[PDB]
Amino acid sequence: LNSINTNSGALIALQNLNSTNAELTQVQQRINTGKKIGSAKDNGAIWATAKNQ
Amino acid sequence: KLQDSLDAGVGNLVDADLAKESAKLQSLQTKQQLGVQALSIANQSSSSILSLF
């Protein structure tokens, strides 16, 4: 509290910014690919099923 | 008649169905424009941290 060495609030704000940045890059993947399941990383079962089909 | 049948078979082997190709052309032009938009949005990501200094 009121300390020089540490600022927890900046850490929480930074992890929140990292979360919104990850959501942004995921949406960028959904537009540049046009697919909501573009790879096995998104969902392996539906992806393998659509691949075989 | 046999020569006409052989030419028809060569056409069945190689010829493309352009009616599918027109829809593919339209969808691919739209997908390319969306991909250029997503690429620009990905290129802009670095700018945000200049304002926090």
UniProtKB/Swiss-Prot annotation, chain B:
Top-level taxon of the source organism: Bacteria
Lineage: Bacteria, Pseudomonadati, Pseudomonadota, Alphaproteobacteria, Caulobacterales
Subunit and partners: In C.crescentus, the flagellar filament is composed of multiple flagellins of 29 kDa; 27 kDa and 25 kDa.
Role, per record: Flagellin is the subunit protein which polymerizes to form the filaments of bacterial flagella.
Name used for this protein in its record: Flagellin FljM
Family: Belongs to the bacterial flagellin family.
Residues of the full protein shown: 220 to 272 of 273
Gene: fljM
Compartments in which it is found: Secreted; Bacterial flagellum
